[PDB]
Ligand SMILES: NC(=[NH2+])NCCC[C@H](N)C(=O)O
């Protein structure tokens with residue numbers, strides 16, 4: 064189908080035009096599950112430089128790529144076939160960029176789960192990814208202010224949760240299809256407020272729009288994982304590669320906070336006849352923030368964002384050294400402590 068494309072203002076102030084744009088973003092998510100935002104020359108330049116750094120990294124030998132791994136943070140390399148979605152291996156190779164915290168940071172010294180330094184392959188790759196994520200973050204903040212305005216909420220409702228937010232990025236290369244298996248990544252939802260994504264010309268991303276009457280699992284609950292759900296049921300919309308745009312769709316936290324007025328968009332990736340480069344950026348609450356229902360003030364349910372992130376990454380990577388160290392040191396119990404002390 065034909066997605067909507069919007070140009071965002073550089074600053075969002077709450078004027079009538081901003082409110083109108085927020086209404087339109089919500090309506091596009093409610094109809095299509097996704098929309099596109101137009102990139103300017105610097106946003107595009109930084110996207111292309113990130114893609115170029117990714118292509119150069121993936122040409123390195125596996126031993127080198129596999130050395131870019133940490134037992135403190137999930138940042139770093141994921142080999143093809145290493146990640147699990149709904150009990151099945153996914154086939155991209157990935158470099159994950161989480162908040163880059165040295166062992167001098169007090170949260171790292173305290174052993175907080177998932178906190179530690181990015182194992183950058185080199186400093187040029189570091190600069191390219193950080194510069195790109197700075198731009199992605201500015202867009203994320205614009206989008207969150209617009210979304211609040213569209214729901215007639217105070218403009219800072221969501222940005223109040225994203226101060227020092229746990230923003231992160233997956234830098235992906237999908238191999239060409241070389242076996243009978245076409246599955247790149249299984250159907251799933253991502254975990255935070257927004258997913259902002261870029262792709263090259265190859266194509267392979269599919270998203271599921273809202274469907275009237277279709278129950279959607281609440282992926283923050285252990286008995287309602289969204290992984291694998293609807294994988295072989297229509298409808299799925301192909302996200303046609305388009306120059307000069309990023310795509311945007313909601314993550315789990317927006318589904319929870321809006322009581323399902325927005326849905327965390329299910330999506331999957333199919334391998335193509337050529338390798339495919341993409342970057343997915345996650346604009347997230349602070350690790351210590353608790354999401355809450357916006358439209359039910361008496362509702363007691365909350366999502367501790369860092370707990371959700373940690374649970375998800377442990378399920379993605381059950382055998383990774385990062386997960387082993389969480390288990391060995393009982394870092395999930397630390398997470399319980401950091402909530403109160
Ligand atoms: N870290 C991610 N966002 N992974 C996206 C794929 C789905 C993930 N393997 C899961 O089971 O939920």
Ligand SMILES: O=C(O)CCC(=O)C(=O)O
Pocket residue numbers: 233235248253260261262268330332341342343
């Ligand atoms: O390949 C894409 O375009 C998006 C991949 C994705 O959903 C992810 O890495 O979470």
Ligand SMILES: [Mn+2]
Pocket residue numbers: 251252253330343
């Ligand atoms: Mn995803």
